[PDB]
């Protein structure tokens, strides 16, 4: 139903933002072709931008937050495939050579990023064991939607927000989509994040 | 400053500061200053 | 010290407007529109402007008659067109029906018609005074103490030939001021703006010396 | 920083300018770590 | 000592902004010299621009607020002359004539503005009954200062703070300011305002 | 108001000297000049020539004391200015070579000697860390005078008052004099020193 990361929830350990930046946050919708692979948006870094959470997080200099993230997919009753969702802590991508990760591939925004190699998740670690981070599954004959809620969890009590992503979000397709002539082509995937018990500091 | 000469003598440091202004001028003389203070991350005002 | 109050000062009946119909002359058009407006005349003006807000209920009657001062029975409608209805284009204009403008039907011969209009303004009181645009002109202005229009009518076919006079008294009831405020040395120079002259006049008459009957 | 607010402000016969002295100290919180040498 | 203009202190009748928005607003410091004619601000236009007070009061629809507004002098002992500082609420300017006033003048900006006719304090009113307003003096024998606290006087319960000014403050040097040789010319003139009790509504 | 040096009142650890001992020895005033730089005057040395006080430490063998020393000045109020006195246990001066400080340096007598170069206090040193000793400050605006009291500090329970110096009072100008035409040059700088708890030994 709904997934604790590492079984906590979010709490406080500066200025508490309230219900203004603590609202839902959709971004703008995915979709999912029967050939598409993957995405990663790789949060905080997703909304330093966008509404008031990106006012707070660029000019306080000091920063610490939880999120919650709901993941969820439209689709027919002739339309089959899944995905995983996981939230991976310090999720640091690679170069694949013939050598340093690009900037735009780092830090995607707040559109996220495609994988070339999902199979190593872009780390060189196999697919097949991301299930041990938190995660779930979405089959599109079961449910349409994935919800996770990820503590604050670093190695410092506050860090800046801008130099550095705490955990990053990976939306793959293990099991490829699949439709009958005459069906929407694309699937949209939509993102919706909220965070919890955020505090700035050093204005 | 003291503080700062056995600073030298560690690798690290932390805590508040304070700092004292004397103004040394004459009984007659009158005045205003401003005194601001930018966090780590900012660069100085431009302006008062 | 009664006669001191606020509510005393501007206690009487005074003469707010003097209108006339004249369908006699070159002109045939047989009625008139008056917007109520309470600072008509510079000696009310003047006094009204001691205060910066104030809320009151007015009472107005009308004095008629014609150039003889003469008043021979004749019939005439007082409309009243309050604030946001369209005012009447000609005699027979379809705004004279219109059963929500209150109209009242009176004789030259009978005693003046009388009659009683409330507080009508959106703000808890009228400002005589607005530092702000209500969105060059537009400074200083409050569409918000709008009274309505009256306009007087003769109930006649076509064209009689006479001239009707009528004159508007108002009374203040009910009066309530705040904030003061001081009062105008300077003559006035238009109707809605404060502005004043280049050439200063003194508050104080002048005297030969400082030391001086 | 230290900003002019107003204009120095004298009677006659009186000098013109002065000056300001600093003095820097540390609170009660403040603590060193890892001896080193200078 | 303080005045409280019209007996009243400023409250409550929305989002109320706390600390950030409530703090001293120090303008930039006038010269009064012996050739020096008056000056008036007309706020809340001053706080339009500057700081969060600024922020919260473009972007809402609604206004509501009272200040505390400190006027202090720095003088020798061998200057003289007096000021007038007031309040006056619906402060209305007018045009002298060899005709509307222009908007530099109206709205004058967190600078303020000079008076032409002090006199007639440029509304065609004596100067001689200012004292009707909530008013304090400065006299440079006597003392430096004047601090006036003015709540919230309007007829509507909530209005717009770009469009209407609520009031605006003179300080007007009645008797000129005279000094002997050698000593310094200006006598500066700073202007301290704290919003009291702000309420800003319709984001 | 008061400085206790150190914390400590002087008191007894012999014949013990009286009232005619005990009392205030005003010695000669010095001016200060905007040109001047400092003052040292290094006692128990200062007395050992004067009265009463000079006559027992000159013909006994041990030595025991602690001093009251009021440094005070005369200046109006068109005068500016900044001195910091000072109270230096084992104050030690040097040679600046181009190598021994003469004995009029070291110990300079009644009337005290001139920094050459107050900036290392003649020591070395840095005159801005001299507040690390006991010390108090003049500035002409605030106050005339500085008082501190030093109870007796050596290693030794007794010594010798003529070979050995226990301390030093230093007065120095880090803010130069101004004054404007007219005024008198030279504001006189006074001192008052008073011994408390004096014991002799050794007759």
Redesign the interface.
């Known amino acids: 139903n709904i997934v604790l990361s590492y079984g906590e929830w979010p709490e406080y350990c500066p200025t508490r933002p309230d219900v203004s930046v603590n609202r839902f946050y959709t971004l703008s919708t995915k979709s999912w072709k029967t050939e598409s692979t993957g995405w990663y948006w790789k949060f905080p870094d997703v909304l330093n931008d966008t509404g008031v959470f990106g006012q707070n997080a660029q000019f306080h200099?000091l920063y610490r937050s939880g999120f919650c993230m709901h993941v969820q997919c439209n689709a027919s009753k002739f339309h089959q495939g899944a995905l995983l969702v996981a939230a991976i802590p310090e999720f640091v991508i690679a170069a694949s050579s013939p050598l340093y990760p690009d900037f735009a591939h780092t830090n995607p925004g707040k559109d996220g990023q495609e994988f070339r190699d999902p199979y190593v998740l872009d780390a060189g670690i196999p697919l097949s064991q991301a299930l041990v981070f938190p995660h779930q599954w979405i089959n599109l004959r079961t449910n349409n939607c994935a919800t996770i809620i990820m503590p604050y969890v670093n190695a410092l009590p506050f860090d800046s927000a801008l130099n550095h992503s705490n955990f990053g979000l990976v939306v793959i397709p293990i099991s490829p989509l699949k439709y009958c002539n005459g069906a929407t082509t694309e699937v949209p995937v939509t993102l919706t994040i909220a965070p919890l018990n955020s505090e700035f500091s050093?204005? | 400053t003291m503080v700062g000469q056995i600073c030298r003598y560690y690798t690290q440091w932390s805590g508040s500061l304070k700092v004292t202004f004397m103004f040394t001028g004459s009984f007659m003389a009158t005045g205003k200053m401003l005194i601001a203070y930018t966090?780590?991350?900012s660069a100085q005002p431009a302006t008062r | 010290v009664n006669e001191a109050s606020v509510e005393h000062f501007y206690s009487r009946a005074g003469l707010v407007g003097v209108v006339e119909v004249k369908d006699s002359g070159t002109s045939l058009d047989g009625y008139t529109v008056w917007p109520i407006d309470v600072m008509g005349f510079v000696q009310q003006r003047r006094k009204l402007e001691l205060s910066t807000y104030m809320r009151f209920d007015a009472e107005f009657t009308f004095v008629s008659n014609l150039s003889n001062s003469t008043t021979p029975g004749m019939l005439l409608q007082y409309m009243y067109v309050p604030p946001g209805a369209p005012k009447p284009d000609g005699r027979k204009s379809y705004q004279w029906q219109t059963a929500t403008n209150p109209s009242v039907f009176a004789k030259l011969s009978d005693p003046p018609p009388q009659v009683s209009v409330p507080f009508m303004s959106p703000a808890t009181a009228y400002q005589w005074f607005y530092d702000g645009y209500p969105t060059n002109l537009q400074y200083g202005q409050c569409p918000n103490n709008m009274m309505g229009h009256f306009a007087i009518r003769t109930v006649s076919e076509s064209t009689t030939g006479k001239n009707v006079h009528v004159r508007v008294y108002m009374r203040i009831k009910h009066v309530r001021a705040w904030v003061p405020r001081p009062l105008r040395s300077q003559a006035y120079m238009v109707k809605n703006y404060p502005t004043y002259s280049q050439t200063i006049t003194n508050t104080a008459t002048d005297r030969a010396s400082i030391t001086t009957t | 920083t230290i900003w002019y607010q107003t204009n120095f402000v004298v009677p006659p016969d009186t000098p013109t300018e002065a000056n300001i002295i600093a003095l820097g100290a540390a609170q009660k919180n403040f603590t060193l770590k890892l001896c080193k040498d200078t």
Chains 1, 5, 6 share one sequence.
């Open positions: 200099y050093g204005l | 966090p780590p991350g």
